[PDB]
Amino acid sequence: RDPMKLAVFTDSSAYLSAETLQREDLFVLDIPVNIDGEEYVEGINLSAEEFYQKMAQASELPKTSQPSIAKLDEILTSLKEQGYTHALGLFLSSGISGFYQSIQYMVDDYEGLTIAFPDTLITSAPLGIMVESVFNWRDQGDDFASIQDKLAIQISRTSAFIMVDDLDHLVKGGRLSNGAAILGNLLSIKPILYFNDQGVIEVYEKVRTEKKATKRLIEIIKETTASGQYRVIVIHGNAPEKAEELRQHLLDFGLGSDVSLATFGSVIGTHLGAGSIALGYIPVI
Ligand SMILES: CCCCCCCCCCCCCC(=O)O
Ligand code: NA
């Protein structure tokens, strides 16, 4: 491996594989979720499996907070003092959190520590695979500049396509424009949303029904992944039967172990609400 002494950061909106969660020098900044005046951190005092029902019994909509910039600063200061030479931070999209813009002033603040915080434009399982890939590339002997190049390609060719049971959480949480709600009919319509090339959640297509929207997610992913080898992830929030159906369609298309399943927990589920489904994709670089 390269003789840099590298630290990798992400936040808990990333869906991290068991592989990645074992890796050295990985720092995950937790995102707290306020429910009825109490602060929860998934994996500490909140399990992902209790979240949707807990939210349904809440007296106001839960609210997420940004990853802690104070803890990022303290960790970076510490890593500098312990002789680390490089830090890579892969955080949730600038289009869904002010955290990315807030940390841009820190990049040059730590003498002797080379820092990069590229805008990943994504979250959830694709973000987690970016983190995984960083370690894979390190294991190939890649240095810091080569890792950044490879990340830049992944970022440019990654997105996710999303359908929610109801647009209320997204609009009320602020990550989807207010207009989008009147954009479209009512209960029945199931718009497909995606991460656009600015990392912002945008309406892709207004679909009339859930059954069609399910098919359309598959058809869109067949198109967007046609050039090369991609990881495709079926991601759901309390929608396991729909997720398994989609996974079966992708396996029948031939995706094999390149298709996997993940879940939306408390952080993303606060914004998407229960009953949500997404297909994420990211090239294997
Ligand atoms: C793959 C689909 C992902 C959908 C993401 C919905 C929006 C999540 C925003 C989470 C913000 C957490 C940190 C914050 O509050 O600033
Ligand atoms: Na392909």
Swiss-Prot record:
SUPFAM superfamilies (UniProt xref): DAK1/DegV-like
Q: Name one GO molecular function term.
A: lipid binding
Q: Name one Pfam family in it.
A: DegV
Annotated function: May bind long-chain fatty acids, such as palmitate, and may play a role in lipid transport or fatty acid metabolism.
Q: Which of this chain's residues are annotated to bind hexadecanoate?
A: 64, 97
NCBIfam families, per database record: DegV
Q: Which organism is it from?
A: Streptococcus pneumoniae (strain ATCC BAA-255 / R6)
Ranges for domain DegV come to 6-283
Protein name listed in UniProt: DegV domain-containing protein spr1415
Q: Which UniProt keywords apply?
A: Lipid-binding
